Amino acid sequence: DIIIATKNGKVRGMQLTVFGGTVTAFLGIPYAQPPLGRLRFKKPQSLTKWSDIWNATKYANSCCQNIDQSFPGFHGSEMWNPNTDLSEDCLYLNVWIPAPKPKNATVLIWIYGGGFQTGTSSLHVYDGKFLARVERVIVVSMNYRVGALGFLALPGNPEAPGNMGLFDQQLALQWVQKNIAAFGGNPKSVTLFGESAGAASVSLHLLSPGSHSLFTRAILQSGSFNAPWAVTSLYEARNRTLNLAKLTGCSRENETEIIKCLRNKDPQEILLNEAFVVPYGTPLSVNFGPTVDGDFLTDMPDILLELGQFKKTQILVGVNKDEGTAFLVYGAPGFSKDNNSIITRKEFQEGLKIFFPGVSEFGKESILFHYTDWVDRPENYREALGDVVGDYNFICPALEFTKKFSEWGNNAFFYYFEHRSSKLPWPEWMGVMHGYEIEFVFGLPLERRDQYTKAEEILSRSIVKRWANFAKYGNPQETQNNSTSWPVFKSTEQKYLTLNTESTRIMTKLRAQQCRFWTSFFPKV
Template identity: 35%
Template sequence: MLQQICLAMLFLVVCNGNASNPTVTVDQGQIIGKRLQFRAQDTDFDVDAYLGIPYAEAPVGPLRFKPPVPKEWQGELNAHEYGNSCPQPAWPDLHWFTLGKTSEDCLILNVYVPVPVRPNRAVLLWIHGGAYSMGAGSFEDFETYPIASLGDVILVSINYRLGVFGFLATGDEVVPGNMGMLDQLEAMKWVQKNIKAFGGDPNRVTIFGESAGSSSVSLHTLSPLSKGLFSGAIMQSGVATSTWAVLEDKTHIPKGAFGIGKLVGCEKEDTKQLVDCLVDVPTDDLLNASQRMMEVFPEDPEAFPFAPVYDDHFIPDRPDTLIKKRSFNHVNIMAGYNADEGTTEFAFFYPDAIEKPHINVTEYESYMAASKLNLTPLQNDALELVYFDNDMLTDPNPNYFDAYVRILQDYSFACSTDTYLRGAAEADAGSVYAYYFNHHPSKSIINTPWSGACHADDLVFFGIHFTPNDFNLTDVEVEMTLKMIQYWTNFAKTGNPNIGTENEEASSPAAKLLEWPQFTLDKRMYKELSPSMNNIPDPSGISCKLWNDYFPKLDAALADKQQECKSHWSKEGKESCSGEATP
């Protein structure tokens, strides 16, 4: 009889056939999962896992480069195994990563439910990072399902199309682009429709992500198509205004599509002929060609063309314009970045270095040129004033490593996050919270002793060391994990990282958390994510004032002077300020 026991409440139907085969009934039929177990702080936790659930049809054949089509199925679905990861290049040799099988039939999601099952739990929906070209929602040895039990929430992780398959665009209506973003949107719709059956509350869904997953989350907070699909958004190292988040120059978008066409034998005259040809190219050929783009076009913007574009549909305008217009969906927001985001680049250049690399002036100038910041001489002088210390100005052979890392971090992460947070606070669309992760883990993502709190190191503190892997953190770091999970899951439950229930006092002793103040325009406070969990003022305030306020004013002033000069010499009938003859 026990095998037939079902818990039914409202629209919730959860039937546990036995401990290893939990079953959920949705409109289309039964989903059969499996039970997972992990141990934390001398306690065993059970999680019902439903893996590899398809939310959209396989985007192959005529569906390649098209918006996702909801998956139709009936009967019984075995959800015991991870689904396919989406096609992607081979990852670097990272000690924690096992990708598994890849296929274009990869539009799946995973649902993790704490045991015992009960109704109306808040939901965290994870959007993975990987430069829009790599990664997966879940894979072995890098699981975050302890969040579900430790935070008493339901966790959902999703796959979406990557690289050329998810973000090819032709600059017109043939392939407007953003298929990967529309995949995320379709997965969010699936959650709204089905999460109640797993015990989830569709009115309390918080989407969260890291890196490209973070900028994806940010784009959903601005997209009119995402309105009403989630109540909270957490951005970890990336926002819609990050320099790498969106391809904003529409003139270069079709170059990427035609460039890939040349490499696979689809050199056509117009975009429709091009796409009709690309649809039939084998998966591996298309993937390999997309990897060669940077080799074939090293100096052209089409070398890295596969990212979101503003398409007048999902992204109706430039992200900075949307923020200025206060075009935010009404959701609660948390966003932040890591203290040493820029060291990741060097970690791959110097994988065997025991000490911080020494970057001389020639190498520094080479890195700056490669970064394509396009700075004027006056802007470069300003950078030296802000980022160079006294030792660098007097040392005959200074190390430019720290200066370059800080420039890269502020330009690519910190200052765009500052712009986004200020815009969200000004729009008053919901509560806003900011964080600054500055703890160097005893075992980091890239396993480098000098990388500090580098890009993606925050992921170590979401419970992955409670599952089988080699992240053996200290007791202090385990405590830090529990606090971070509590902040994140409290935010999912109430929109406030300090409290987990509406009638709970923010200062409750049971919480064991230091209060996290809201980010406001007059008090731009950040939570320091470290063992101390202090509250600090904006950690990049001065440098971001340089990037966000001073540089635009300097550009405007120089442009005005140039126009004034040209106007003067034009009236005189002589050469312009640039030395060119005037008409």
């Protein structure tokens, strides 16, 4: 058996067989009072207490959230949908600990992405039992509130202050500071890692003075708060909150009255309306996300970043080669997972309209300009629109974050993931898609039984070791198997490392031309 005495009381885990060995899992440990009723929209409140043993033996409810129904039956999209019941009663977390119980293990705290609107920690690709087996770290993950239930903002108003999902994340990190030593974990050795919105959330914990002391280091996969989807401004947030009240017929004179009304609405009505709180929204729309609440976040993050006002520590940051493709089949004309999507100039022009709703005419023409001069290919426009979307949304904000961060003294490591999963269910033209490094990081290809190639095992093995070396030692080398040394990202040289199954290479200045466009010029339009 395996009871562990936490501050809140005792909890039971379950033994897992992994790679001829054992991991102990604690699935579904509550970390907050369920945010129901009076508590919906509020910050997570400290969890009651309890005698008797809590069975943390299965994954807990996933938070309310709209589901991706664009490809029913399709593993590509469906692997991302919640795989446990939705419920507002969702403030739970998971612990994988090596067997035997470690003495002082480094801890990795995963924060899932999904645009701040969706996601859950119980996804198969977020399963921590491998990292715990293989690198002997303890892996933790938590569910946090998404969509309006997690980010509805009416700032300076504790009824719905904004940022509740982040404070959920924070409360979980805290639970780790208070309880992980009982699990053989070292609260002084915690690395947050996360992907996409998850990566952005991690970068926001680097800015939140509330988070400073609740972790050691950070990893950002395909996301950073300076991405253009990451932060709703106070204006658009308030607009959106009201727009929502309107659609639920919860418009009121008084603002606490609006909240009180929104709290009698049922999750579904809120979920159903979340979509049209925005004018023209895109496949990247973040209807309810992080804002400048003057609590988690004290100023526009761009200012804090520019001015070195953040946790001084090492970071590991990275993006995938074809970041933007996943999004083009959610609205872009003549794109389809089911053919090769050779599109015309005219179609390219219309897709911009889709990704840059407004965004002026000249703005769009300037994107078309920067992106349509070439060594002349039917796939030209198709390739270009994916690259427009990844660069603007993922790659360039990540390279600029690394740059800005690194300028203040800390070591930074940058990777460019370029391996297309041999099992990817999406078609070929989509390439190395957004989110498809995660399974490498979590070490699924280490599982011989699971239809990955040998080369894939090897590559995941190495990534898994670099991630682990990073968390434990702030240095993501793989020192034993005669590997390519990963250099720090300097402003000036901007070296980054390439991850693939063949030649792993040191390279400089990723997307140089592209990012000058997006980073210098584009904000001005």
